[PDB]
CSV table of N, CA and C and ligand atoms in Angstrom, one decimal:
chain,number,residue,atom,x,y,z
A,160,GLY,N,89.2,98.0,137.5
A,160,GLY,CA,90.3,97.2,137.6
A,160,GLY,C,91.6,97.7,137.0
A,161,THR,N,92.7,97.0,137.2
A,161,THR,CA,94.0,97.5,136.8
A,161,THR,C,94.5,96.7,135.6
A,162,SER,N,93.8,95.7,135.1
A,162,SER,CA,94.3,94.9,134.0
A,162,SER,C,94.6,95.6,132.7
A,163,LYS,N,93.6,96.4,132.3
A,163,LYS,CA,93.9,97.2,131.1
A,163,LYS,C,95.0,98.2,131.3
A,164,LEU,N,95.1,98.8,132.5
A,164,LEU,CA,96.1,99.7,132.8
A,164,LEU,C,97.5,99.0,132.6
A,165,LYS,N,97.6,97.8,133.2
A,165,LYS,CA,98.9,97.1,133.1
A,165,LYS,C,99.2,96.8,131.6
A,166,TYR,N,98.2,96.5,130.8
A,166,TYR,CA,98.4,96.2,129.4
A,166,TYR,C,99.0,97.4,128.7
A,167,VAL,N,98.4,98.6,129.0
A,167,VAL,CA,98.9,99.8,128.4
A,167,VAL,C,100.3,100.2,128.8
A,168,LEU,N,100.7,99.9,130.1
A,168,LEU,CA,102.0,100.2,130.6
A,168,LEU,C,103.0,99.1,130.2
A,169,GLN,N,102.6,98.1,129.5
A,169,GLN,CA,103.5,97.0,129.1
A,169,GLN,C,104.5,97.6,128.1
A,170,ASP,N,105.8,97.4,128.5
A,170,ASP,CA,107.0,97.9,127.7
A,170,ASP,C,106.9,99.3,127.4
A,171,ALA,N,106.2,100.1,128.2
A,171,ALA,CA,106.2,101.6,127.9
A,171,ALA,C,107.5,102.2,128.3
A,172,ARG,N,107.7,103.4,127.8
A,172,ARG,CA,108.7,104.3,128.3
A,172,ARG,C,108.0,105.4,129.1
A,173,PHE,N,108.7,105.9,130.1
A,173,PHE,CA,108.1,106.9,131.0
A,173,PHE,C,109.1,108.1,131.1
A,174,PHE,N,108.4,109.3,131.2
A,174,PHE,CA,109.2,110.6,131.3
A,174,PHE,C,108.5,111.5,132.3
A,175,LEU,N,109.3,112.0,133.2
A,175,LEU,CA,108.8,113.0,134.1
A,175,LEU,C,108.6,114.3,133.4
A,176,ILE,N,107.4,114.9,133.6
A,176,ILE,CA,107.2,116.2,133.0
A,176,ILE,C,107.0,117.2,134.2
A,177,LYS,N,107.8,118.3,134.2
A,177,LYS,CA,107.7,119.3,135.2
A,177,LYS,C,107.2,120.5,134.6
A,178,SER,N,106.1,121.1,135.2
A,178,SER,CA,105.5,122.3,134.7
A,178,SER,C,105.6,123.4,135.7
A,179,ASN,N,106.0,124.6,135.3
A,179,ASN,CA,106.2,125.7,136.2
A,179,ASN,C,104.9,126.2,136.8
A,180,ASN,N,103.7,125.9,136.2
A,180,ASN,CA,102.5,126.4,136.7
A,180,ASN,C,101.4,125.4,136.5
A,181,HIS,N,100.3,125.5,137.3
A,181,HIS,CA,99.2,124.6,137.2
A,181,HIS,C,98.3,124.9,136.0
A,182,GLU,N,98.3,126.1,135.5
A,182,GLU,CA,97.4,126.5,134.4
A,182,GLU,C,97.7,125.6,133.1
A,183,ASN,N,98.9,125.3,132.9
A,183,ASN,CA,99.2,124.6,131.6
A,183,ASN,C,98.9,123.1,131.8
A,184,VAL,N,99.1,122.6,133.0
A,184,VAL,CA,98.6,121.2,133.2
A,184,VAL,C,97.1,121.1,133.1
A,185,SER,N,96.4,122.1,133.6
A,185,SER,CA,94.9,122.2,133.5
A,185,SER,C,94.6,122.3,132.0
A,186,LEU,N,95.3,123.1,131.2
A,186,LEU,CA,95.0,123.2,129.8
A,186,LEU,C,95.3,121.9,129.1
A,187,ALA,N,96.3,121.2,129.5
A,187,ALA,CA,96.7,119.9,128.9
A,187,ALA,C,95.6,118.9,129.2
A,188,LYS,N,95.0,118.9,130.4
A,188,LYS,CA,94.0,117.9,130.7
A,188,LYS,C,92.7,118.2,129.9
A,189,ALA,N,92.5,119.5,129.6
A,189,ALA,CA,91.2,119.9,128.9
A,189,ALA,C,91.3,119.7,127.4
A,190,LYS,N,92.5,119.9,126.9
A,190,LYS,CA,92.7,119.9,125.4
A,190,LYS,C,93.4,118.7,124.9
A,191,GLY,N,94.0,117.8,125.8
A,191,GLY,CA,94.7,116.7,125.3
A,191,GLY,C,96.0,116.9,124.6
A,192,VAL,N,96.7,118.0,125.0
A,192,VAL,CA,97.9,118.4,124.3
A,192,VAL,C,99.0,118.7,125.4
A,193,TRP,N,100.3,118.6,124.9
A,193,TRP,CA,101.4,119.0,125.7
A,193,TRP,C,102.5,119.6,124.8
A,194,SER,N,103.2,120.6,125.3
A,194,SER,CA,104.4,121.2,124.7
A,194,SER,C,105.5,121.3,125.7
A,195,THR,N,106.7,121.1,125.2
A,195,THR,CA,107.9,121.1,126.1
A,195,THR,C,109.0,121.9,125.4
A,196,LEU,N,110.1,122.0,126.0
A,196,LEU,CA,111.3,122.7,125.5
A,196,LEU,C,111.9,121.8,124.4
A,197,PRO,N,112.7,122.4,123.5
A,197,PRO,CA,113.2,121.6,122.3
A,197,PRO,C,114.0,120.4,122.7
A,198,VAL,N,114.8,120.5,123.7
A,198,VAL,CA,115.7,119.4,124.1
A,198,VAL,C,114.8,118.2,124.5
A,199,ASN,N,113.7,118.4,125.2
A,199,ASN,CA,112.8,117.4,125.6
A,199,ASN,C,111.9,117.0,124.4
A,200,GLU,N,111.5,117.9,123.6
A,200,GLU,CA,110.7,117.5,122.4
A,200,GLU,C,111.4,116.6,121.5
A,201,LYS,N,112.7,116.8,121.3
A,201,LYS,CA,113.5,115.8,120.5
A,201,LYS,C,113.5,114.4,121.1
A,202,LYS,N,113.7,114.3,122.4
A,202,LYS,CA,113.7,113.0,123.1
A,202,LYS,C,112.3,112.4,123.0
A,203,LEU,N,111.2,113.1,123.2
A,203,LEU,CA,109.9,112.5,123.2
A,203,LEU,C,109.6,112.0,121.8
A,204,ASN,N,110.0,112.7,120.7
A,204,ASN,CA,109.8,112.3,119.4
A,204,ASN,C,110.5,111.0,119.1
A,205,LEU,N,111.7,110.9,119.5
A,205,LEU,CA,112.5,109.6,119.4
A,205,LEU,C,111.8,108.5,120.1
A,206,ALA,N,111.4,108.8,121.4
A,206,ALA,CA,110.8,107.7,122.2
A,206,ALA,C,109.5,107.2,121.6
A,207,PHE,N,108.7,108.2,121.0
A,207,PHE,CA,107.4,107.8,120.4
A,207,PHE,C,107.5,106.8,119.4
A,208,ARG,N,108.6,106.9,118.5
A,208,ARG,CA,108.7,105.9,117.5
A,208,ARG,C,109.3,104.6,118.0
A,209,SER,N,109.9,104.5,119.2
A,209,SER,CA,110.7,103.4,119.7
A,209,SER,C,109.9,102.5,120.6
A,210,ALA,N,108.7,102.9,121.1
A,210,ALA,CA,108.0,102.2,122.2
A,210,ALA,C,106.6,102.1,121.9
A,211,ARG,N,105.9,101.0,122.3
A,211,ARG,CA,104.5,100.8,122.2
A,211,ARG,C,103.7,101.9,122.8
A,212,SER,N,104.2,102.4,124.0
A,212,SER,CA,103.6,103.5,124.7
A,212,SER,C,104.7,104.4,125.3
A,213,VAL,N,104.5,105.7,125.2
A,213,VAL,CA,105.3,106.7,125.9
A,213,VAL,C,104.4,107.4,126.9
A,214,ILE,N,104.7,107.3,128.2
A,214,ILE,CA,103.9,107.8,129.2
A,214,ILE,C,104.5,109.1,129.8
A,215,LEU,N,103.8,110.2,129.9
A,215,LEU,CA,104.2,111.4,130.5
A,215,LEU,C,103.6,111.5,131.9
A,216,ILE,N,104.4,111.6,132.9
A,216,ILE,CA,104.0,111.7,134.3
A,216,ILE,C,104.2,113.1,134.8
A,217,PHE,N,103.1,113.8,135.1
A,217,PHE,CA,103.1,115.3,135.3
A,217,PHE,C,103.3,115.7,136.7
A,218,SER,N,104.1,116.7,137.0
A,218,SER,CA,104.3,117.3,138.3
A,218,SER,C,104.5,118.8,138.2
A,219,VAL,N,103.5,119.5,138.8
A,219,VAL,CA,103.7,121.0,138.8
A,219,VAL,C,104.7,121.3,139.9
A,220,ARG,N,105.7,122.2,139.5
A,220,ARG,CA,106.7,122.6,140.4
A,220,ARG,C,106.2,123.2,141.7
A,221,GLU,N,106.7,122.8,142.8
A,221,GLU,CA,106.4,123.2,144.2
A,221,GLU,C,105.0,122.7,144.7
A,222,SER,N,104.4,121.9,143.9
A,222,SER,CA,103.1,121.4,144.4
A,222,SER,C,103.3,120.2,145.3
A,223,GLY,N,104.4,119.5,145.3
A,223,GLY,CA,104.6,118.3,146.1
A,223,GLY,C,103.8,117.2,145.7
A,224,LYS,N,103.3,117.2,144.4
A,224,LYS,CA,102.5,116.1,144.0
A,224,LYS,C,102.7,115.9,142.5
A,225,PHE,N,102.3,114.7,142.0
A,225,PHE,CA,102.1,114.5,140.6
A,225,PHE,C,100.6,114.7,140.3
A,226,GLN,N,100.3,115.3,139.1
A,226,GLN,CA,98.9,115.6,138.8
A,226,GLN,C,98.3,114.6,137.9
A,227,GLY,N,99.0,113.5,137.5
A,227,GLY,CA,98.4,112.5,136.7
A,227,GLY,C,99.4,112.0,135.6
A,228,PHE,N,98.9,111.1,134.7
A,228,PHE,CA,99.8,110.7,133.6
A,228,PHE,C,99.0,110.4,132.4
A,229,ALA,N,99.7,110.5,131.2
A,229,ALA,CA,99.1,110.4,129.9
A,229,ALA,C,100.0,109.7,128.9
A,230,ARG,N,99.4,109.2,127.8
A,230,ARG,CA,100.2,108.5,126.8
A,230,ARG,C,100.3,109.4,125.6
A,231,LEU,N,101.5,109.6,125.0
A,231,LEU,CA,101.7,110.2,123.8
A,231,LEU,C,100.8,109.5,122.7
A,232,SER,N,100.0,110.3,121.9
A,232,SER,CA,99.4,109.7,120.8
A,232,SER,C,99.9,110.2,119.5
A,233,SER,N,100.8,111.1,119.5
A,233,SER,CA,101.5,111.6,118.3
A,233,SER,C,102.9,112.2,118.6
A,234,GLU,N,103.7,112.4,117.5
A,234,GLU,CA,104.8,113.2,117.6
A,234,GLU,C,104.4,114.6,117.7
A,235,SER,N,105.4,115.5,117.9
A,235,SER,CA,105.1,116.9,118.0
A,235,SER,C,104.8,117.5,116.6
A,236,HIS,N,103.8,118.4,116.5
A,236,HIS,CA,103.4,119.1,115.3
A,236,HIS,C,103.3,120.5,115.5
A,237,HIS,N,103.6,121.3,114.5
A,237,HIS,CA,103.5,122.8,114.5
A,237,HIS,C,102.4,123.3,113.7
A,238,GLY,N,101.8,124.5,114.1
A,238,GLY,CA,100.9,125.2,113.3
A,238,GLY,C,99.4,124.8,113.3
A,239,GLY,N,99.1,124.0,114.3
A,239,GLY,CA,97.7,123.5,114.4
A,239,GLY,C,96.8,124.5,115.1
A,240,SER,N,97.3,125.3,116.0
A,240,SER,CA,96.6,126.1,116.9
A,240,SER,C,97.6,126.9,117.8
A,241,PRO,N,97.2,128.0,118.3
A,241,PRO,CA,98.1,128.7,119.3
A,241,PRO,C,97.7,128.5,120.7
A,242,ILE,N,98.1,127.3,121.2
A,242,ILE,CA,97.7,126.9,122.6
A,242,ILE,C,98.1,128.0,123.5
A,243,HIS,N,97.1,128.5,124.2
A,243,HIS,CA,97.3,129.7,125.0
A,243,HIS,C,97.9,129.2,126.3
A,244,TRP,N,99.2,128.7,126.2
A,244,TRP,CA,99.9,128.4,127.4
A,244,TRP,C,100.1,129.7,128.2
A,245,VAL,N,100.1,129.5,129.6
A,245,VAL,CA,100.5,130.6,130.4
A,245,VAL,C,102.1,130.5,130.6
A,246,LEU,N,102.7,131.5,130.1
A,246,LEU,CA,104.2,131.5,130.0
A,246,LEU,C,104.8,132.1,131.2
A,247,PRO,N,105.7,131.4,131.9
A,247,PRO,CA,106.5,132.1,133.0
A,247,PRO,C,107.7,132.8,132.5
A,248,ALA,N,108.5,133.3,133.4
A,248,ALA,CA,109.7,134.1,133.0
A,248,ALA,C,110.7,133.2,132.2
A,249,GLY,N,111.2,133.9,131.2
A,249,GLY,CA,112.2,133.3,130.3
A,249,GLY,C,111.6,132.4,129.2
A,250,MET,N,110.4,131.8,129.5
A,250,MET,CA,109.8,130.9,128.5
A,250,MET,C,108.8,131.7,127.6
A,251,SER,N,108.9,131.4,126.3
A,251,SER,CA,108.2,132.1,125.3
A,251,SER,C,107.5,131.0,124.4
A,252,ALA,N,106.6,131.5,123.6
A,252,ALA,CA,105.7,130.6,122.8
A,252,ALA,C,106.4,129.9,121.7
A,253,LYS,N,107.5,130.5,121.2
A,253,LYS,CA,108.3,129.8,120.2
A,253,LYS,C,109.0,128.6,120.7
A,254,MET,N,109.4,128.6,122.0
A,254,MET,CA,110.1,127.5,122.6
A,254,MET,C,109.2,126.3,122.9
A,255,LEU,N,108.0,126.6,123.3
A,255,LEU,CA,106.9,125.6,123.5
A,255,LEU,C,106.1,125.4,122.2
A,256,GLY,N,106.7,125.5,121.1
A,256,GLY,CA,106.0,125.6,119.8
A,256,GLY,C,105.4,124.2,119.4
A,257,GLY,N,106.2,123.1,119.5
A,257,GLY,CA,105.7,121.8,119.1
A,257,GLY,C,104.7,121.3,120.1
A,258,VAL,N,103.5,120.8,119.5
A,258,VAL,CA,102.4,120.3,120.3
A,258,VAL,C,102.3,118.8,120.0
A,259,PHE,N,102.3,118.1,121.2
A,259,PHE,CA,102.1,116.7,121.1
A,259,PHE,C,100.6,116.4,121.5
A,260,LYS,N,100.0,115.4,120.9
A,260,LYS,CA,98.7,115.0,121.3
A,260,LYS,C,98.8,113.9,122.4
A,261,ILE,N,98.0,113.9,123.4
A,261,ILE,CA,98.1,113.0,124.5
A,261,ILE,C,96.8,112.5,124.9
A,262,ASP,N,96.7,111.2,125.3
A,262,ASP,CA,95.5,110.6,125.9
A,262,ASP,C,95.8,110.5,127.4
A,263,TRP,N,94.9,111.0,128.2
A,263,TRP,CA,95.1,111.0,129.6
A,263,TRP,C,94.7,109.5,130.1
A,264,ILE,N,95.6,109.0,131.0
A,264,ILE,CA,95.2,107.7,131.5
A,264,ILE,C,94.8,107.9,133.0
A,265,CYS,N,95.3,109.0,133.6
A,265,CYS,CA,94.8,109.3,135.0
A,265,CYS,C,94.9,110.8,135.2
A,266,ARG,N,93.9,111.4,135.6
A,266,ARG,CA,93.9,112.9,135.9
A,266,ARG,C,93.9,113.1,137.4
A,267,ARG,N,94.0,112.1,138.2
A,267,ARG,CA,94.1,112.2,139.6
A,267,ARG,C,95.5,112.5,140.1
A,268,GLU,N,95.5,113.1,141.3
A,268,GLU,CA,96.8,113.5,142.0
A,268,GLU,C,97.4,112.3,142.7
A,269,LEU,N,98.8,112.4,142.9
A,269,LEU,CA,99.4,111.5,143.8
A,269,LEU,C,100.5,112.3,144.5
A,270,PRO,N,100.4,112.4,145.9
A,270,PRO,CA,101.4,113.2,146.6
A,270,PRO,C,102.8,112.5,146.6
A,271,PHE,N,103.8,113.3,146.6
A,271,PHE,CA,105.2,112.7,146.6
A,271,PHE,C,105.4,111.8,147.8
A,272,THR,N,104.7,112.1,148.9
A,272,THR,CA,105.0,111.2,150.1
A,272,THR,C,104.6,109.7,149.8
A,273,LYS,N,103.7,109.5,148.8
A,273,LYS,CA,103.3,108.1,148.5
A,273,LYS,C,104.3,107.4,147.6
A,274,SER,N,105.2,108.1,146.9
A,274,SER,CA,106.2,107.5,146.0
A,274,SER,C,107.5,107.5,146.6
A,275,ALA,N,107.6,107.7,147.9
A,275,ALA,CA,109.0,107.8,148.6
A,275,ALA,C,109.8,106.5,148.5
A,276,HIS,N,109.1,105.4,148.2
A,276,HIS,CA,109.8,104.1,148.2
A,276,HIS,C,110.3,103.7,146.8
A,277,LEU,N,110.1,104.6,145.8
A,277,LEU,CA,110.4,104.3,144.3
A,277,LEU,C,111.6,105.2,144.0
A,278,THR,N,112.7,104.6,143.5
A,278,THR,CA,113.9,105.3,143.0
A,278,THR,C,114.0,105.0,141.6
A,279,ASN,N,114.7,106.0,140.9
A,279,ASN,CA,114.8,106.0,139.5
A,279,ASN,C,116.2,105.6,139.1
A,280,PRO,N,116.5,104.5,138.6
A,280,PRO,CA,117.9,104.1,138.2
A,280,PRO,C,118.5,105.1,137.2
A,281,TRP,N,117.7,105.7,136.4
A,281,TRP,CA,118.3,106.7,135.4
A,281,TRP,C,118.5,108.1,136.0
A,282,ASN,N,118.2,108.3,137.3
A,282,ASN,CA,118.6,109.5,138.0
A,282,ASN,C,119.3,109.1,139.3
A,283,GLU,N,120.3,108.3,139.2
A,283,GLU,CA,121.2,108.0,140.3
A,283,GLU,C,120.4,107.4,141.5
A,284,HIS,N,119.3,106.7,141.2
A,284,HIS,CA,118.5,106.1,142.2
A,284,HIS,C,118.0,107.1,143.2
A,285,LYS,N,117.9,108.4,142.8
A,285,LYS,CA,117.2,109.4,143.6
A,285,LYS,C,115.7,109.0,143.6
A,286,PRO,N,114.9,109.5,144.6
A,286,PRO,CA,113.5,109.3,144.6
A,286,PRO,C,112.9,109.8,143.3
A,287,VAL,N,111.9,109.1,142.8
A,287,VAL,CA,111.4,109.3,141.5
A,287,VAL,C,110.8,110.8,141.4
A,288,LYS,N,110.3,111.3,142.5
A,288,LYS,CA,109.9,112.7,142.4
A,288,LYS,C,110.9,113.7,142.0
A,289,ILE,N,112.2,113.3,142.2
A,289,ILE,CA,113.3,114.2,141.9
A,289,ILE,C,113.7,114.0,140.4
A,290,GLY,N,113.8,115.1,139.7
A,290,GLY,CA,114.3,115.0,138.3
A,290,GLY,C,113.9,116.3,137.5
A,291,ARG,N,114.7,116.6,136.5
A,291,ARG,CA,114.4,117.7,135.7
A,291,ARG,C,113.2,117.4,134.7
A,292,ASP,N,112.6,118.4,134.2
A,292,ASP,CA,111.6,118.3,133.1
A,292,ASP,C,112.3,117.4,132.0
A,293,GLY,N,111.6,116.3,131.7
A,293,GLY,CA,112.0,115.4,130.6
A,293,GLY,C,112.8,114.2,131.1
A,294,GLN,N,113.1,114.1,132.4
A,294,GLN,CA,113.9,113.0,132.9
A,294,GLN,C,113.2,111.7,132.6
A,295,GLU,N,113.9,110.7,131.9
A,295,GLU,CA,113.3,109.4,131.7
A,295,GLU,C,113.3,108.6,133.0
A,296,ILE,N,112.2,107.9,133.2
A,296,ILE,CA,112.1,107.0,134.3
A,296,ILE,C,112.1,105.6,133.8
A,297,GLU,N,113.0,104.7,134.4
A,297,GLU,CA,113.2,103.4,134.0
A,297,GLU,C,111.8,102.5,134.2
A,298,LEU,N,111.7,101.5,133.4
A,298,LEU,CA,110.5,100.8,133.2
A,298,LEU,C,109.8,100.3,134.5
A,299,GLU,N,110.6,99.7,135.4
A,299,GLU,CA,110.0,99.1,136.6
A,299,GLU,C,109.5,100.2,137.6
A,300,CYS,N,110.4,101.2,137.7
A,300,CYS,CA,110.0,102.4,138.6
A,300,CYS,C,108.8,103.1,138.0
A,301,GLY,N,108.8,103.4,136.7
A,301,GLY,CA,107.6,104.1,136.1
A,301,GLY,C,106.4,103.3,136.2
A,302,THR,N,106.5,102.0,135.9
A,302,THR,CA,105.3,101.1,136.1
A,302,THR,C,104.7,101.2,137.4
A,303,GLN,N,105.6,101.0,138.5
A,303,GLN,CA,105.1,101.0,139.8
A,303,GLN,C,104.5,102.4,140.2
A,304,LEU,N,105.2,103.4,139.8
A,304,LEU,CA,104.7,104.8,140.1
A,304,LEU,C,103.2,105.0,139.5
A,305,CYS,N,103.0,104.6,138.2
A,305,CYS,CA,101.7,104.8,137.7
A,305,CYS,C,100.6,104.0,138.4
A,306,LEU,N,101.0,102.7,138.8
A,306,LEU,CA,100.1,101.9,139.6
A,306,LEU,C,99.7,102.5,141.0
A,307,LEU,N,100.5,103.4,141.5
A,307,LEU,CA,100.2,104.0,142.8
A,307,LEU,C,99.1,105.1,142.7
A,308,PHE,N,98.9,105.6,141.5
A,308,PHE,CA,97.9,106.6,141.4
A,308,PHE,C,96.5,106.0,141.7
A,309,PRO,N,95.6,106.8,142.3
A,309,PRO,CA,94.2,106.4,142.4
A,309,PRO,C,93.6,106.1,141.1
A,310,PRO,N,92.8,105.0,141.0
A,310,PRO,CA,92.1,104.8,139.7
A,310,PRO,C,91.3,105.9,139.3
A,311,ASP,N,91.3,106.2,138.0
A,311,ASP,CA,90.5,107.3,137.4
A,311,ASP,C,89.3,106.6,136.7
A,312,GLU,N,88.2,106.5,137.3
A,312,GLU,CA,87.1,105.8,136.8
A,312,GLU,C,86.3,106.6,135.7
A,313,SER,N,86.8,107.8,135.4
A,313,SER,CA,86.2,108.6,134.3
A,313,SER,C,86.8,108.3,133.0
A,314,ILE,N,87.9,107.4,132.9
A,314,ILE,CA,88.6,107.2,131.8
A,314,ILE,C,88.5,105.7,131.3
A,315,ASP,N,88.1,105.5,130.1
A,315,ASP,CA,88.0,104.1,129.5
A,315,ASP,C,89.2,103.8,128.7
A,316,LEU,N,90.0,102.9,129.2
A,316,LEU,CA,91.3,102.6,128.5
A,316,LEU,C,91.1,101.8,127.2
A,317,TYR,N,89.9,101.5,126.8
A,317,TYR,CA,89.7,100.7,125.6
A,317,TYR,C,90.2,101.4,124.4
A,318,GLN,N,89.8,102.7,124.2
A,318,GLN,CA,90.3,103.5,123.0
A,318,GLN,C,91.8,103.7,123.0
A,319,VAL,N,92.4,103.8,124.2
A,319,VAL,CA,93.8,103.9,124.3
A,319,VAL,C,94.5,102.7,123.7
A,320,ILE,N,94.0,101.5,124.1
A,320,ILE,CA,94.6,100.3,123.7
A,320,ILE,C,94.5,100.1,122.2
A,321,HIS,N,93.4,100.7,121.5
A,321,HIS,CA,93.3,100.6,120.1
A,321,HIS,C,94.3,101.5,119.4
A,322,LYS,N,94.7,102.7,120.0
A,322,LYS,CA,95.8,103.5,119.4
A,322,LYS,C,97.1,102.8,119.3
A,323,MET,N,97.4,101.9,120.2
A,323,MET,CA,98.5,101.0,120.1
A,323,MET,C,98.4,100.0,118.9
B,438,ITJ,C1,103.2,123.7,128.3
B,438,ITJ,N1,104.6,123.2,128.7
B,438,ITJ,C2,105.2,123.8,129.9
B,438,ITJ,N2,104.5,124.8,130.6
B,438,ITJ,C3,105.2,125.3,131.8
B,438,ITJ,CL1,104.4,126.6,132.7
B,438,ITJ,N3,106.5,124.9,132.2
B,438,ITJ,C4,107.1,123.8,131.4
B,438,ITJ,C5,108.3,123.2,131.7
B,438,ITJ,C6,109.3,123.5,132.8
B,438,ITJ,N4,108.5,122.3,130.7
B,438,ITJ,N5,107.4,122.3,129.8
B,438,ITJ,C7,106.5,123.3,130.4
């Protein structure tokens, strides 16, 4: 069912995460972690303190899809482990230094064609698939986007609700 999902999304904040490769989204699903550039790390740390739930909605660049979404379970922390991120051009391990802990709510894909009807007021009402890494998605757009994903029956939202 969708009732516990809707409870988790209640009053959440939503952020578009753009990853330059699949390997790091795969690593994030396996390890329950995410790292981003400092400008976005600052925004997510602020949001984490301000909202009952901060949801990261993931999209690998050029995949034409979202790869799932997750809830921040911590602010960023340094020095816990050297997450073997696969680094593309220009990006280095010091920039991706802060690690957030995340609980996955859905590890299933959603193609961009399925969200064509959702626009993001905080990005000039462009289609929600359009946005830079770290772009905030307004509550109603973000809620409807998350509800479009296929249910992920491997995930029990009970423990997530307790983190709140
Ligand atoms: C592990 N975090 C990340 N990994 C890769 Cl390949 N790209 C990005 C971007 C564009 N923001 N955060 C990223």
